[PDB]
Amino acid sequence: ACDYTCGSNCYSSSDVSTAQAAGYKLHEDGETVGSNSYPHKYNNYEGFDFSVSSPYYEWPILSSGDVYSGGSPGADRVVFNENNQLAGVITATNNFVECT
Template sequence: MRLLDLLLPFFLIPLSLALPAEPLPLIPRACATTCGSHCYTSSQVSKALSAGYNYYESGDKAGSSKYPEKYNDYEGFDFGGVSGPYYEFPILESGVYSGGSPGADRIVFNTDGDLAGEITHTGASGNDFVGCTGTS
């Protein structure tokens, strides 16, 4: 019998005991904000802001939509010191909005391209908005 055959169990048994009995759960992605049940990463927020502000600066709209659209803040949100005037632009889990149905969720930015917050129609009355997490 070879020495390796004798020593192998002494290495494999501790190694197998160190491994978890069940697969480890996936680490959930970090939500920068949550609108209703929609979780948006900081990358998704940043991409929506960039697209919305680029349309604003060029005077264009996304496809045949009305976005970015002036946002009047009738709800009176606290945008953490970011002053208006404000514009709203859709944010989607599936990618950057380019026209069509905007869904319920929006990012809000000012004319300097500063992110003011995120808002949603989900859970609001009529055509009003409520704040997503981080916007009150």
């Protein structure tokens, strides 16, 4: 169902756990993909109230259901921490708002 609503895009908790696992795996290998080299630290300058502690890492979640593997990241991102805990799902307005 829509556990997370990012504008036009509805994501289930299952869609989120698949994206997060691909981002965490790369984070553990010290590997990055794309121009902007994701996953990368997310500093939470928006001051969102996450349930888990930082440091935070951001990885793109794609509306198509594909796994991010380069090119355009789109507007949505999964935020997770160093302990592979999900902090939240955000969407762009560089500047973001939380998904509902």
